[PDB]
Design a protein around this ligand. Structure first.
Ligand SMILES: CCCCCCCCCCCCCCCCCC(=O)OC[C@H](COP(=O)(O)OCCN)OC(=O)CCCCCCCCCCCCCCCCC
Ligand SMILES: CCCCCCCCCCCCCCCCCC(=O)OC[C@H](COP(=O)(O)OCCN)OC(=O)CCCCCCCCCCCCCCCCC
Ligand SMILES: CCCCCCCCCCCCCCCCCC(=O)OC[C@H](COP(=O)(O)OCCN)OC(=O)CCCCCCCCCCCCCCCCC
Ligand SMILES: CCCCCCCCCCCCCCCCCC(=O)OC[C@H](COP(=O)(O)OCCN)OC(=O)CCCCCCCCCCCCCCCCC
Ligand SMILES: CCCCCCCCCCCCCCCCCC(=O)OC[C@H](COP(=O)(O)OCCN)OC(=O)CCCCCCCCCCCCCCCCC
Ligand SMILES: CCCCCCCCCCCCCCCCCC(=O)OC[C@H](COP(=O)(O)OCCN)OC(=O)CCCCCCCCCCCCCCCCC
Ligand SMILES: CCCCCCCCCCCCCCCCCC(=O)OC[C@H](COP(=O)(O)OCCN)OC(=O)CCCCCCCCCCCCCCCCC
Ligand SMILES: CCCCCCCCCCCCCCCCCC(=O)OC[C@H](COP(=O)(O)OCCN)OC(=O)CCCCCCCCCCCCCCCCC
Ligand SMILES: CCCCCCCCCCC1=C(C)C(=O)C(OC)=C(OC)C1=O
Ligand SMILES: CCCCCCCCCCCCCCCCCCCC
Ligand SMILES: CCCCCCCCCCCCCCCCCCCC
Ligand code: SF4
Lengths: 162, 198, 314, 60, 100, 102
């Protein structure tokens, strides 16, 4: 259980690091899908079975499909992206990487000073999640429907062709 | 007696290598996927052979790919018009090894009755042919007979099993001609049915 | 090394391996059986010469596709081009990995179940997308976008068609789903769920009549991987339909695996008959049917199923 | 589309499936070349020969 | 027997990686990709926190997070397609006409 | 329990042998045998509709497995959710968003 957690976390970290430094958009999206599968494995190792199932079903099965679809529609041949490699220049990324490293050290220092009895990994099913969802979290469900409706209306208004 | 391509040579055929070659030839001759290519009326007779009354599927030769990459057999079933000849050559070049060619009908054999300004006189002017079918059109069972002739020719050819080990030359069997094979039983014919009946 | 725990572990692993091998063999023999059954439906014989009754034909195409020259397009993305048939095979194979073929004969008794099936189908759309993109052919790319838009239009209600059966069982587990069918099979209460699941399962498997092509560049063994994965998906969809709507392995007299195999073979034959019988609708008609008819039908079926369940819980 | 159109179309699809299944229950129309020899009518235009007169000399 | 700090550290690492990808990339598509990495890392942090406390609240917050991620991906890709239609490039530095 | 760890081992072997079988099939196919347009926005719109309705589908997935525990109150809430879903679908169909042909 822990062994799967560490391997899946390492795979997610390495795949995301491959994502943010890659030039090909389809390869970057493939590495992102791999990282999402690894994060789903992390979810399954922690007992969040519904979260891992939705991580593959929706995040790696709908949202990344939309990203891949849009990349095909653009026909991205790396025009002025691969031919420049501006993010690979050390003078470009040395600043933001140092900033992200400083923020990571601050967050990790805050994390390490918290009480931790360990995660038991007892499986929390989708039945309990649905009980909470339509019990104490009813208005979250209905206003999330309104949020998805707003996203639908906005994306239809903007993404037409005429 | 064999013909080499990389020369009139002899049989190169360990006993396990011969068995592997026989297994590969059996699998290749029993799974022949033709390319769906329509040139003229001979194609109508070919797809007639594909239908229920003849059922060329019984020989495992019905899959009829629309892509040259997935096809193992090219049937030139029709006239090789001069505007269609580069198309035929390009589709043949897009095919992958091993590939075989059947000329179907007098047009594909030699130009047929169309010794005319706009017709290439036979497809073997520019692409190599394995089996020729005379006829205008050959009937569907003539196409099936040519398919069996191609199966016999495939069943004792020699090709490399792998591209990393061994001889990479292709050895094709120098068959006895069907004319000389059938001459004994054809000349002995004396009487035929009179053409006034059904 | 003699211990009952290790013996049970090895027995369960051996049962899973047997299930995997039988499913892959049944997919290849399903390609051969599609040729034979199309012959039966069309007043002919099909392949009946290579071996006894044509039974050795599949070995002949396997040998032919193995010893065909392996070819990749020159300006193609090699990794993605190789990766598409991997997905097309493995996705619905791993979807089969939850199917209970008999009491005590299952690979994984997961608590997610048909959620794992939905995971596998949502991953399986990438095979079509990757085959279209990586081939470096604009006809193949356009065909892949059309096919993937169709599969999204039917994947949008595949799970909602299963949700009536899930609601009746009260669980995502497949053993609980087939145990809730101990008295009446789910095809009777979830009939509209059954037909919507049938339409969605045929559409996401790229079967007739939902079949400028994204496979024209593939050849040799990758094309065979595409075909064998398609037939494995046919077997997986048929087995899932049997387990979710026709009691799984439950039956009066025959052994449970005999009942499961008979029902799966019947739905396999119905796949073949659907290909032989129906004409192909237009693309816009197919997608309008997916969005306007089937998805509201699944939603209304779920609502009525919940109303019946809560009314019957006194 | 109309509900009646959908129902009529569904019944039409069921009818097509039923007729193809009954076609499966029918007699095969295949002539099994080459095991079954092809019947040819006596004036069929196939291979050309040269014949002999009844005295045995060639007619040409 | 997995520490809560280890899961939070993994989520923080993924979050800062996504933010770095959002900053260093001139392409709008890679910016949207980094945004998706960031929101998925935050949702993973919520899942880790919910699994430590043995509550469904982490998975419920995950559900809300991915609903937001889906709708934001939809809107962002619509705006990216509009940008590609009206400018034929995805350079985000060129979209800078309002300043001062 | 021995049964669950046996099933975990069997599932792991299933995934490993399936992936390895497909990999070995590709390797054998490579080793054997000798050698020798602008996409419309409707594609994006359809994929976007799939994403949005798939998220609403996940909400209904969570509801469906716990229908008896939620009671009639959960039925009323899910009926409101499904009515909002269907109103959005009716709106999409009526404005020509879901019409492939113009
Ligand atoms: C081996 C070295 C590395 C080799 C290269 C990488 C290969 C893939 C490695 C990651 C996936 C497999 C990890 C190993 C899992 C083995 C099984 C295991 O550990 O099960 C434990 C646990 C079972 O559940 P639980 O009830 O908690 O068990 C306690 C016992 N009662 O299990 C769980 O709770 C969850 C089990 C894991 C989650 C499911 C599978 C996730 C798959 C993620 C793939 C990500 C993409 C990989 C791409 C690789 C190529 C770049
Ligand atoms: C063909 C005959 C199928 C008969 C059948 O479905 O039997 C299974 C079941 C019988 O009920 P059961 O309780 O299993 O009887 C044995 C005693 N325990 O029967 C049922 O559970 C009812 C199944 C009805 C299926 C109707 C549609 C069948 C396919 C067309
Ligand atoms: C124009 C605007 C739109 C209008 C609407 C259009 C869409 C309409 C969609 C309708 C959907 C109807 C779905 C009905 C399902 C009802 C059955 C059901 O869900 O029963 C559940 C119950 C099992 O549940 P339970 O008893 O709880 O078992 C676990 C034990 N604790 O099951 C049982 O106990 C067995 C009950 C068997 C019931 C069989 C009869 C009903 C289902 C079959 C209908 C067939 C219709 C045929 C075609 C009609 C014309 C279209
Ligand atoms: C293991 C699981 C699978 C096992 C196999 C068994 C299930 C197979 C399911 C096959 C589903 C095929 C669905 C095809 C839907 C086609 C819809 C469509 O686009 O129809 C278009 C057509 C005309 O549309 P319209 O807009 O009116 O245009 C008129 C313009 N002049 O509109 C019409 O003609 C209206 C009617 C359309 C079709 C209605 C649905 C028919 C479904 C197929 C028949 C299934 C019968 C049962 C089979 C056995 C099931 C066990
Ligand atoms: C998502 C899908 C939504 C739609 C389906 C929903 C579920 C089914 C709900 C009920 C459907 C009833 C359909 C209408 C039946 C009666 C009318 C009818 O058959 O219409 C079709 C057609 C009409 O005839 P017409 O085309 O005008 O030709 C001139 C002939 N006078 O007449 C004909 O073609 C001739 C008669 C054909 C009868 C076909 C069978 C009708 C009953 C089917 C019951 C269920 C079958 C399940 C699968 C069986 C096969 C495995
Ligand atoms: C066991 C496998 C299944 C066996 C059959 C099970 C029952 C199937 C019921 C559904 C199909 C019923 C027949 C549908 C049909 O085709 O009805 C035709 C009526 C007349 O309609 P018409 O337009 O005249 O068509 C003539 C067709 N010869
Ligand atoms: C080409 C290859 C690409 C990569 C393929 C996958 C990489 C990893 C391969 C090795 C996997 C090793 C074994 C992993 C663990 C298996 C057992 C397991 O998942 O156990 C955890 C849990 C058990 O549930 P259960 O025990 O019933 O719960 C009650 C409490 N005990 O069960 C669960 O939580 C079940 C849910 C997790 C199942 C994950 C299955 C694989 C998912 C990724 C599929 C990728 C498909 C190919 C690529 C698609 C395109 C990217
Ligand atoms: C409750 C929500 C508000 C009220 C909705 C009323 C029903 C929907 C409606 O107004 O339908 C009329 C509309 C007219 O169609 P139009 O947009 O002109 O043309 C494109 C498609 N022909 O046609 C359409 O919009 C096409 C149908 C869309 C249906 C969306 C869901 C509405 C609820 C009914 C569900 C019916 C499910 C299938 C029933 C048959 C099952 C066998
Ligand atoms: C090797 C596995 C084959 C599975 C089935 C392949 C597709 C159906 C048979 C081939 C075929 C195709 C494609 C076809 O399009 C066709 O119509 C012209 C035929 O009839 C002559 C066919 O026989
Ligand atoms: C064309 C416009 C390009 C804009 C690029 C902006 C890059 C900003 C990089 C910031 C780097 C900060 C480095 C760390 C500073 C010290 C730590 C934070 C403050 C305490
Ligand atoms: C098309 C069906 C595919 C099934 C794949 C899995 C096959 C597993 C076979 C298991 C056989 C034994 C089942 C338990 C014993 C009960 C039945 C005994 C008579 C067969
Ligand atoms: S040989 Fe005769 S039948 Fe064949 S293509 Fe030529 S004209 Fe047509």
């Amino acid at each position: 259980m822990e062994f799967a957690f560490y391997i899946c976390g390492l795979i997610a970290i390495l795949a995301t690091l491959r994502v943010i430094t890659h030039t090909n958009p389809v390869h970057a999206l493939l590495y992102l899908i791999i990282s999402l599968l690894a994060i789903s494995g992390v979810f399954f190792s922690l007992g969040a079975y519904f979260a891992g199932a939705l991580e593959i079903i929706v995040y790696a099965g709908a949202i990344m499909v939309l990203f891949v679809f849009v990349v095909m529609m653009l026909n991205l041949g790396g025009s002025e992206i691969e031919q420049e490699r501006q993010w690979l220049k050390p003078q470009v990324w040395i600043g933001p990487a140092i900033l992200s490293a400083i923020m990571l050290v601050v967050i990790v220092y805050a994390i390490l000073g918290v009480n931790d009895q360990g995660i038991d990994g007892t499986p929390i099913s989708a039945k309990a999640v649905g009980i909470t969802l339509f019990g104490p979290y009813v208005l979250a469900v209905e206003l999330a429907s309104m949020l998805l409706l707003a996203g639908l209306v906005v994306a239809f208004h903007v993404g037409r062709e005429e | 007696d064999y013909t080499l391509t990389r020369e009139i040579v002899t049989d190169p055929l360990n006993v396990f290598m011969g068995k592997l070659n026989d297994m590969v030839n059996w699998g290749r001759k029993n799974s022949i996927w033709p390319y769906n290519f329509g040139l003229s009326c001979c194609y109508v007779e070919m797809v007639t052979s594909f239908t229920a009354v003849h059922d060329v599927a019984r020989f495992g030769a019905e899959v009829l790919r629309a892509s040259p990459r997935q096809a193992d057999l090219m049937v030139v079933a029709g006239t090789c018009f001069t505007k269609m000849a580069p198309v035929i050559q390009r589709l043949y070049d897009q095919m992958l090894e091993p590939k075989w060619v059947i000329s179907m009908g007098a047009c594909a054999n030699s130009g047929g009755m169309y010794d005319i300004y706009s017709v290439v006189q036979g497809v073997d002017k520019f692409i190599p042919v394995d089996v020729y079918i005379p006829g205008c059109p050959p009937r569907p069972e003539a196409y099936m007979q040519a398919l069996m002739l191609l199966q016999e020719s495939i069943g004792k050819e020699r090709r490399p099993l792998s591209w990393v080990v061994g001889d990479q030359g292709v050895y094709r069997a120098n068959m006895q001609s069907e004319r000389e094979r059938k001459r004994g039983e054809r000349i002995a014919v004396t009487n035929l049915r009179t053409p006034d009946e059904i | 090394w003699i211990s009952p725990e290790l013996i049970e572990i090895l027995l369960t692993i051996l049962k899973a391996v047997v299930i995997l091998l039988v499913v892959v063999t049944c997919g290849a023999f399903m390609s051969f059986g599609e040729r034979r059954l199309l012959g039966l439906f069309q007043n002919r014989y099909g392949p009946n010469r290579v071996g006894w009754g044509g039974s050795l034909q599949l070995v002949a195409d396997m040998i032919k596709m193995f010893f065909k020259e392996d070819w990749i397009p020159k300006f193609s993305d090699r990794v993605i081009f190789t990766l598409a048939p991997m997905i097309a095979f493995t996705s619905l194979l791993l979807a089969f990995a939850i199917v209970p073929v008999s009491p005590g004969w299952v690979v994984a008794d997961l608590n997610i179940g048909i959620l794992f099936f939905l995971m596998m189908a949502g991953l399986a759309v990438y095979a079509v997308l990757f085959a279209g993109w990586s081939s470096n052919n604009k006809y193949s790319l356009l065909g892949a976008m059309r096919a993937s838009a169709q599969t999204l239009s039917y994947e949008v209600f595949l799970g909602l068609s299963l949700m009536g059966v899930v609601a009746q069982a009260g669980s995502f587990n497949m053993t609980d789903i087939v145990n809730s069918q101990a008295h009446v099979w789910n095809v009777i209460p979830q009939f509209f769920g059954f037909i919507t699941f049938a339409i969605a399962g045929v559409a996401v498997c790229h079967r007739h009549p939902f079949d400028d092509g994204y496979h024209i560049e593939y050849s040799g063994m990758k094309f065979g991987l595409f075909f064998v994965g398609e037939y494995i998906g046919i077997v997986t969809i048929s087995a899932l339909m049997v387990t979710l709507f026709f009691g799984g392995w439950q039956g009066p007299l025959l052994p449970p695996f005999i009942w499961f195999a008979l029902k799966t073979a019947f739905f396999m034959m119905m796949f073949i008959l659907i290909r032989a019988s129906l004409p192909r609708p237009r693309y816009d008609q197919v997608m309008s049917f997916g969005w306007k008819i089937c998805l509201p039908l699944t939603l209304i079926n779920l609502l009525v199923t919940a109303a019946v369940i809560l009314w019957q819980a006194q | 589309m109309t509900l009646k159109e959908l129902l009529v179309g569904f019944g039409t699809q069921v009818r097509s499936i039923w007729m193809i299944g009954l076609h499966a229950f029918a007699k095969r129309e295949t002539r099994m070349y080459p095991e079954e020899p092809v019947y040819l009518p006596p004036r069929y235009r196939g291979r050309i020969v040269l014949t002999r007169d009844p005295d045995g000399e060639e007619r040409c | 027997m997995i520490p809560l700090q280890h899961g939070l550290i993994l989520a923080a690492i993924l979050f800062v990686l996504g933010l770095t990808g959002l900053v260093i990339r001139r392409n709008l598509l890679f910016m949207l990709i980094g945004l998706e990495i960031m929101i998925n890392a935050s949702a993973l942090a919520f899942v880790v926190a919910g699994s430590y406390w043995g509550q469904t609240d982490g998975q419920v917050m995950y559900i809300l997070a991915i609903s937001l991620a889906a709708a934001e991906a939809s809107i962002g890709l619509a705006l990216l397609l509009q940008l590609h239609r009206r400018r034929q490039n995805l350079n985000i530095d060129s979209v800078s006409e309002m300043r001062g | 329990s021995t049964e669950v760890i046996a099933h975990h081992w069997a599932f792991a072997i299933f995934l490993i042998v399936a992936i390895g079988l497909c990999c070995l099939m590709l390797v054998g196919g490579w080793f054997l045998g000798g050698r020798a347009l602008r996409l419309s926005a409707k594609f994006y719109l359809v994929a976007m509709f799939f994403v949005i309705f798939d998220v609403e589908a996940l909400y209904l997935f969570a509801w469906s497995t716990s229908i008896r525990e939620s009671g009639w109150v959960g039925f009323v809430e899910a009926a409101i959710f499904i009515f909002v879903l269907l109103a959005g679908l009716v709106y999409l169909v009526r404005i020509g968003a879901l019409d492939w042909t113009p």
